[PDB]
Amino acid sequence: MKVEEILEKALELVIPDEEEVRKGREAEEELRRRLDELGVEYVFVGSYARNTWLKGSLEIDVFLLFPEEFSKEELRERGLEIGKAVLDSYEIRYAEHPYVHGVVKGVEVDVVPCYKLKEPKNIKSAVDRTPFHHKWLEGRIKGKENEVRLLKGFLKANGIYGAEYKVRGFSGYLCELLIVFYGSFLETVKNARRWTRRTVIDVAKGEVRKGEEFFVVDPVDEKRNVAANLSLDNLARFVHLCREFMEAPSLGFFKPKHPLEIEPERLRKIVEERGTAVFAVKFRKPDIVDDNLYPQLERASRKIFEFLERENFMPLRSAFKASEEFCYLLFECQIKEISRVFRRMGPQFEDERNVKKFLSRNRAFRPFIENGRWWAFEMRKFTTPEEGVRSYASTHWHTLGKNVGESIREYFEIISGEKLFKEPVTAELCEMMGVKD
RNA sequence: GGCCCGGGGCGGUUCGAUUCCGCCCUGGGCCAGC
DSSP states (O other): OOHHHHHHHHHHHHSOOHHHHHHHHHHHHHHHHHHHHTTOOEEEEHHHHTTOOOTTOOEEEEEEEEETTSOHHHHHHHHHHHHHHHOSEEEEEESSSEEEEEEETTEEEEEEEEEEOSSSTTOOSHHHHHHHHHHHHHHHHTTOHHHHHHHHHHHHHTTOOOOSTTTOOOOHHHHHHHHHHHSSHHHHHHHHTTOOTTEEEETTTTEEEEOSSOEEEETTEEEEETTTTOOHHHHHHHHHHHHHHHHSOOGGGSSOOOOOOOOHHHHHHHHHHHTOEEEEEEEEOOSSOHHHHHHHHHHHHHHHHHHHHHTTOOEEEEEEEEOSSEEEEEEEESOSOOOSEEEEEEEETTOHHHHHHHHHSOOSSOOEEETTEEEEEEEOSOOSHHHHHHHHHHHHGGGSOHHHHHHHHHOOEEEOHHHHHTSTTHHHHHHHHTOOO
16 A cells, blocks of 8 residues: 555556567567568667557557658658558558558557658658657666556546647657656656646756746757647646655556546536536537647637636636537536626726717716716627627637637537536536536 | 747727737748657
């Protein structure tokens, strides 16, 4: 029930078992031969090449080295030809440039084209930098592979493992740099508790300093921040997570939490107890990749949240969920209904010119003075949050992300009441309201 | 696609807008993809 005790039990959940390892080995061997028969110049990279992959995430990464002088077109075409001839099954994928994904003797494989270069400068795509990251990591991580797995298991279990937009957490590469720096999972965790939003971790200089933002400098390029996409709040959840684990080590820190679903009836009662306005904007999920979609759901959610606050509906928090089918932007406000009348600030009494224009507007109520300036009573076009967002979304669809906005323009609706509790959003709502138990 | 910085045009709203809500062109930086 002590740190060392728990970590020994944790390796069991993070380290791949013999069969998963053997399987991976037989795929590597078979893949090596198929490539050598074609006399292809390649290099194995990633967590599989450095035996640092988390149990259950076996995936082999093969990068095809190409002469610096080739056109990007050659790399894709020849790269496609090679992946095609060497994979049991294939499928083109797309990052900054297209590549090939597939299977070999049961395991997931990525056949990626890149330039074989000496010295990081002259890098044309992120994929060119990968081989360099690999060379730097291969000699320094050796011997600490399980410290990397324990760290990965910890972040994954707690929903902040990857660096893609759906997570905004800690990439694999970042985890290995963290181990090379701190020496182990426990040391990483012990020190992370002292991290601030101004921390700068420079692996190459073996230094830690104060910067303007959380910055983990890439050993292979000092101008690159490896944790660039680690969100501020995620950085915060990690720090607090380390403080907790060191205070009461548990195996539950490496185990994914059960969705702990709640019956909608109880949900309704809680929204009743809160006396707030809870609603969602439902529309169709545009057919695009998570990496383009989630940042859009974030913008759309934010723009609307801001509309709600300047409109005085006192928004508490927002959320959002995607599905195969639709997208939901969730909201909770403190004001279910606001009066129709509100007060507008006018000019100071001395301003005769502007006071006159301020009174020229025929209004239903006749303005008044207070503290030296005129004020007017005006009437709102809407008096409820839902009613406000129907207006906002209908006319400001274009500011909600290129795709999400285009979809909301062609269709959207606002759900509330029971009708909401029946949509695939009860989990997001529970996280958004702090529902506990 | 999203984020940061900067140019040139507009619409709306307001007593009053560079200053709030937004739309066109447009220069550079960065992020995810592995």
